[PDB]
Structures are given as structure tokens and as C-alpha cells.
Design an enzyme around this catalytic site. Structure first.
Site, PDB file in Angstrom:
ATOM      1  N   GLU A 190      -1.154  -5.199  13.713  1.00  0.00           N
ATOM      2  CA  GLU A 190      -0.128  -6.108  14.213  1.00  0.00           C
ATOM      3  C   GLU A 190      -0.596  -6.887  15.439  1.00  0.00           C
ATOM      4  O   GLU A 190      -0.255  -8.062  15.610  1.00  0.00           O
ATOM      5  CB  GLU A 190       1.140  -5.314  14.533  1.00  0.00           C
ATOM      6  CG  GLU A 190       2.260  -6.121  15.158  1.00  0.00           C
ATOM      7  CD  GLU A 190       3.577  -5.373  15.135  1.00  0.00           C
ATOM      8  OE1 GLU A 190       4.225  -5.338  14.066  1.00  0.00           O
ATOM      9  OE2 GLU A 190       3.954  -4.804  16.181  1.00  0.00           O
ATOM     10  N   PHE A 235       0.875  -1.156   0.000  1.00  0.00           N
ATOM     11  CA  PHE A 235       0.000   0.000   0.000  1.00  0.00           C
ATOM     12  C   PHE A 235       0.916   1.210   0.000  1.00  0.00           C
ATOM     13  O   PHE A 235       1.903   1.247   0.734  1.00  0.00           O
ATOM     14  CB  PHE A 235      -0.902   0.008   1.236  1.00  0.00           C
ATOM     15  CG  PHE A 235      -2.011  -0.999   1.176  1.00  0.00           C
ATOM     16  CD1 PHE A 235      -1.735  -2.362   1.222  1.00  0.00           C
ATOM     17  CD2 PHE A 235      -3.331  -0.586   1.035  1.00  0.00           C
ATOM     18  CE1 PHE A 235      -2.761  -3.301   1.127  1.00  0.00           C
ATOM     19  CE2 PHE A 235      -4.363  -1.516   0.939  1.00  0.00           C
ATOM     20  CZ  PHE A 235      -4.076  -2.877   0.984  1.00  0.00           C
TER      21      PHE A 235
END
Ligand SMILES: O=c1ccn([C@@H]2O[C@H](COP(=O)(O)OP(=O)(O)O)[C@@H](O)[C@H]2O)c(=O)[nH]1
Ligand SMILES: COC(=O)CCCCCCCCO[C@@H]1O[C@H](CO)[C@H](O)[C@H](O)[C@H]1O
Ligand SMILES: [Cl-]
Ligand SMILES: [Cl-]
Ligand SMILES: [Hg+2]
Ligand SMILES: [Hg+2]
Ligand SMILES: [Hg+2]
Ligand SMILES: [Hg+2]
Ligand SMILES: [Hg+2]
Ligand SMILES: [Mn+2]
Length: 263
Positions: A221, A60
Site C-alpha cells: 500500500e 489472492f
């Protein structure tokens, strides 16, 4: 159906001689931990080429991050899955800002301005951060149904020190007595099916957290770690696969620095 490998001449593996004596090379659920010296890339390249394997690499690049694309792609051309079919997927809000990078044969790039498509175009998906550069070999040794990468700042830490989400109110919650490793949100992958299952699970978990007014300490995460704790990866990549030489130097335990942060 997998056809037979051709005759190959290489050093005979030695049963009574450990691969590495300085690091763990297999997890408790029998998944290999990928370190330099544990694999013969010639054998692996043969195995994956005989399957005409196509690897999708997704990144991205939003706002100011589009500036990292040139180096990322140029170095990927030199070190990422060279010899195999590669399809780069660049998700960006600035299509016209994507650099014109020269690609080797059998490699293509698609710009997606910001599914079932991945299932028909690639066999494996590798999802990484764009503010990085490849400095050494990153090949088929990483391919498997599902893999996570050891965070370079916690590979030697006890689980209690892991920065997992510790609030029970969060879907990403992991108690102090649980946890195998601390995986990086910036480098994971596997088969298209497994990657989509993981992203689908995290997306739903984050939605639940949002509705409950809570945000995991380390966002995506944190959820990734919860997923990999409950769904053991079939391969774990060593820190060689995501390092920051500026902040961590070059330790003896790392024979190669393959993918690194850009200062
Ligand atoms: O505003 C942003 C923030 C992040 N990213 C992507 O998400 C990655 C991981 O987030 P970031 O690099 O900002 O934090 P790090 O993961 O470097 O702590 C970035 O490398 C980019 O690939 C992006 O495109 N735009
Ligand atoms: C992903 O982080 C890196 O690639 C650089 C690591 C440098 C060495 C110190 C590692 C621990 C601190 O880094 C931060 O760790 C938190 C989780 O505790 C997050 O992963 C942040 O992204 C990372 O910068
Ligand atoms: Cl991605
Ligand atoms: Cl990603
Ligand atoms: Hg070995
Ligand atoms: Hg992805
Ligand atoms: Hg998840
Ligand atoms: Hg998510
Ligand atoms: Hg995730
Ligand atoms: Mn990053």
C-alpha cells in the site's frame, strides 16, 4: 474505432447545477472522482459494450483466506460488471478448496496455483482483496487507464496525517508536504498495460528496499501510494468502493456501500 451510440432518452445534464455539492468530483489533474450521482450508467454501459469490453478481476486466496471465496464470487456475480464479459483469476495455494460458484453467461473463472496472458484475455484488470463482499453496483464507471480508491479511513484527512512511508531511506518515501490522497492497496486497476507497469514498478521498488534492509510501513500500500503520487490515476474511486460498515458505519456522504469488508 468506436461506433456511434444509439438514440437514448435520459435526463439532460444541467450546466448550472453541480452534480454533488458535498464532495469533490474531479481531481486537480482533471480525473473524475467516482461518486453515486456523478454518472449515468446507461450511457457508460453502452459505451463499453460497444467495445465488447472484458474485465479481469484478480484475487489472492492463500491459506485460511480460501474461506472468503464463496461469498466474494457469489456477490460479484450479483454486482460486478453485470452485463459485461468478466474473467475471474483466483490465485491460491489450495486449488481444490476453491468453491464451485455458478456464473452467469459470458463470465469465467480460472484457478492459478501459487503476465502476457492478461494482455490477450482481458482489456482491464481490477485487483482486490478477497475478504470482502459486493453489496451494490460496481460497474464500468470505474474503468479507465489507471485508477486508485480512496481509503475509507483517510478521505477526510490532511496529507500530514496520511500514513505514507516517511523514511527517506525507503523507495516509498513521501514527505509531509506532498500527496494528493491516501489510496487503498486493496482496490486498484486499469488497463492491463498500466496495471502491469504499476506492479512492475512496485516490485522493483520493494526489492530495492529489501536489499537496503527496510520495509515500508504499510507494505504494498505504501508503494502503491508513491506510484499514484508520481503517476496520477485517470479516475479515482470514492470510499463507496471499499468500506467497512462495522468500523465506519454508513455516513450520509455515502449514498451507496458497494464493496465491503467481511466481519
Ligand atoms: O495471508 C494472507 C494475507 C493476505 N491475503 C490476501 O491479501 C489481502 C489483503 O491482506 P489482508 O486482508 O490480510 O489485510 P487487510 O488488507 O485486510 O488489512 C487479503 O484480503 C487476501 O486477499 C492472502 O491471501 N493471504
Ligand atoms: C483498508 O482498511 C479498511 O478497509 C477498514 C478501515 C476502517 C476505518 C479505519 C481506517 C484506518 C485504519 O485502517 C488501517 O489503515 C492502514 C493505513 O493507515 C492500512 O490501510 C490497514 O490495512 C487498515 O486496516
Ligand atoms: Cl490481485
Ligand atoms: Cl489485489
Ligand atoms: Hg450529477
Ligand atoms: Hg492484479
Ligand atoms: Hg510503486
Ligand atoms: Hg510489490
Ligand atoms: Hg503496488
Ligand atoms: Mn483485506
Amino acid at each position: 474505432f468506436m461506433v456511434s451510440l444509439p438514440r437514448m432518452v435520459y435526463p439532460q445534464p444541467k450546466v448550472l447545477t453541480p452534480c454533488r455539492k458535498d464532495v469533490l468530483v474531479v481531481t486537480p489533474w482533471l480525473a473524475p472522482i467516482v461518486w453515486e450521482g456523478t454518472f449515468n450508467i446507461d450511457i457508460l454501459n453502452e459505451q463499453f459494450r460497444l467495445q465488447n469490453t472484458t474485465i479481469g478481476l484478480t484475487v489472492f486466496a492463500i491459506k485460511k483466506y480460501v474461506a472468503f471465496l464463496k461469498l466474494f464470487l457469489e456477490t460479484a456475480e450479483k454486482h460486478f460488471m453485470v452485463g459485461h464479459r468478466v474473467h475471474y483469476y483466483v490465485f491460491t495455494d489450495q486449488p481444490a478448496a476453491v468453491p464451485r460458484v455458478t456464473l452467469g453467461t459470458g463470465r469465467q473463472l480460472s484457478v492459478l496455483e501459487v503476465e502476457r496472458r492478461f494482455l490477450s484475455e482481458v482489456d482491464y484488470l481490477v485487483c482486490v482483496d478477497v475478504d470482502m463482499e459486493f453489496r451494490d453496483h460496481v460497474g464500468v464507471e470505474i474503468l479507465t487507464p489507471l485508477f486508485g480508491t480512496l481509503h475509507p479511513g483517510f478521505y477526510g484527512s490532511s496529507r500530514e496525517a496520511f500514513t505514507y512511508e516517511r523514511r527517506p531511506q525507503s523507495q516509498a518515501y513521501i514527505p509531509k508536504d506532498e500527496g494528493d490522497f491516501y489510496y487503498l492497496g486493496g482496490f486498484f486497476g486499469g488497463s492491463v498495460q498500466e496495471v502491469q507497469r504499476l506492479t512492475r514498478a512496485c516490485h522493483q521498488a520493494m526489492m530495492v528496499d529489501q536489499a537496503n534492509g527496510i520495509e515500508a510501513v504499510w507494505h504494498d500500500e505504501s508503494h502503491l501510494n508513491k506510484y499514484l503520487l508520481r503517476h496520477k490515476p485517470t479516475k479515482v474511486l470514492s470510499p463507496e468502493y471499499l468500506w467497512d460498515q462495522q468500523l465506519l458505519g454508513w455516513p450520509a456522504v455515502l449514498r451507496k456501500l458497494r464493496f465491503t469488508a467481511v466481519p
